[PDB]
Amino acid sequence: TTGRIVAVIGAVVDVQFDEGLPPILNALEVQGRETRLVLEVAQHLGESTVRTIAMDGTEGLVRGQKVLDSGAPIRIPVGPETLGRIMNVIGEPIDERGPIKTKQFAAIHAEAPEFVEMSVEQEILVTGIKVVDLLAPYAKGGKIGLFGGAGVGKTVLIMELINNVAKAHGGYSVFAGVGERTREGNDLYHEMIESGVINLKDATSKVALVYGQMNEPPGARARVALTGLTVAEYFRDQEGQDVLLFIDNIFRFTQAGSEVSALLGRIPSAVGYQPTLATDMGTMQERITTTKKGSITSVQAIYVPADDLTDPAPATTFAHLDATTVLSRAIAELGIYPAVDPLDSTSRIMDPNIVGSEHYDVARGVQKILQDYKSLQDIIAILGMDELSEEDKLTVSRARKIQRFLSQPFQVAEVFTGHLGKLVPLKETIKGFQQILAGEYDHLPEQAFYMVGPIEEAVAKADKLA
Template structure:
């Protein structure tokens, strides 16, 4: 569907990962040595000097700007990992004898990051859309490196270790993840209302977890018990069976329309499916799949 070009910048990551990506793209036909390839790979691995690692993201961005400005293309720019760009800048700054600022980062952190991120933009000729992997040191979202990066991004998808420990994949934290287009003027009133209500019930559940851990569910009010039950169902319903992950999970991938997703969450919030067991919500598509799974579980229980 994407008719433009794609640029992949491997910044400060393992050589093996870049090699695997290159050969995978060769096998799938994304890169065609004898034909018209629409992908360029730029690497500065972790064994390279800090100067090379600091420049590779800018090199990839310059290539993207060429395709946008000179060839009028819509360009996808992937950067893995943008934190290594900051890390390399910190090492270069130390070599130059600059006095470090907060947490040991370079005093020019905001300038360096802004100088790169603000070049990723749309013009009359074309556009650059960037997807960036962001390593978060010690899972601290307030660390200066990721915090400076987040300030420039339109959307952030935060992966959580605690959600991964529950076996929920993708392990996206809906409370820390954000998007600027989650606005009723853009997504519509219903979508916005359902999304914010989902976040609200998950936040309420999170605030009740300490009480549950100390006193147990029995000490909660009936209203709070209902919040916990619905939140746990929503949490499991947020798991997604991906086609690309089928070999790992054993669950067949499902493509669900946006309106079906909104309707499904709305029905859970309204209590329409309070009678269904929460295990039926795990790794399902829309709410009709959940209902089928609940029927299967009921038959299995009845047959025992």
């Protein structure tokens, strides 16, 4: 039956249904609008009234305007017919190539796979990225979090990673743009058409695109992550394959929540966040997973606000992850790229029983030599290097060489750092950092290790300096 708007505050709308009140999470349709304004129920306020969070701009709403329940939550197309197509939060396609034609549709709200459905297999995923593959390497069908403050190297890293893994992948891939720049889609789309992963002429298309950028109102940014992951859910369960899920930016989900929580009638938590931050993230994140029916490798870039790693948003995100790769501004401003903190990044896979004890013992050695260098950094900060002992003088010199050998020229970094992009095989990375640790290169200068692929290029780089 019909329901009447009795109140409008921001993106939070109040609808009164005299007949048969619609449940929570149901998608409503507003009449008298030029384009489909969807309202998603959040709560029943009593007296035949519900509270809903809009899916678009609320400008031009009259107190009285009729609304119609759709007897279902928000529904979107899924399956192979969505590949090579961009759609918004509510399923409407936005690449202007006609509507998306399928038989199969799904709801963007779903329960998390039951405990029994969880997988326990742990196998490494090589990336060709040195700082990652050595110290915090991702696992096939694992949860990958790319933490980073403003302008530190997330969207660039997650693009390199696509170029590395997504292109040379057998199964399908889903990209979900959540609350980032719109041109960041127009870049990805035209770059992907160019590389063939999106095919316009035929349908050999491999990647599915969903967007809800920072132009979209809170409600849309709040649910657009769900839209994407639901498209990914299908390729995991209903077809049972190796799905790659990419999300940028996962923070905009909790930020958008932050934006409406006030108006929803909550009392503000820490940092003025939604009190429901804990569970809002849980139910949504636990879906993005590998099951016994299929596997999802999930790379999610995480915006850190005010470089505050203790902000309730990035700090709650850790708990949901298998591999955390933390990007640091200090590292970035030292001209180290990728700006990955080699002591704050961790992988649940770093276990000799998986990566091999030879991998593990080089990762633990590099971390020890770097922790020791960092703990001497407060004494050198005042005194200068001259004052160290002759034992420590060496450890400093190696750690610094290691620091720069952890830097790497990416292929997506080419078109502004002038250097040819590089992927490094895992045997070359382990053997590389072993030799620096073993003292074979105590004679090469530090900058010879700066921005190079394999270790054999450091030797080449040192010879150049004649």
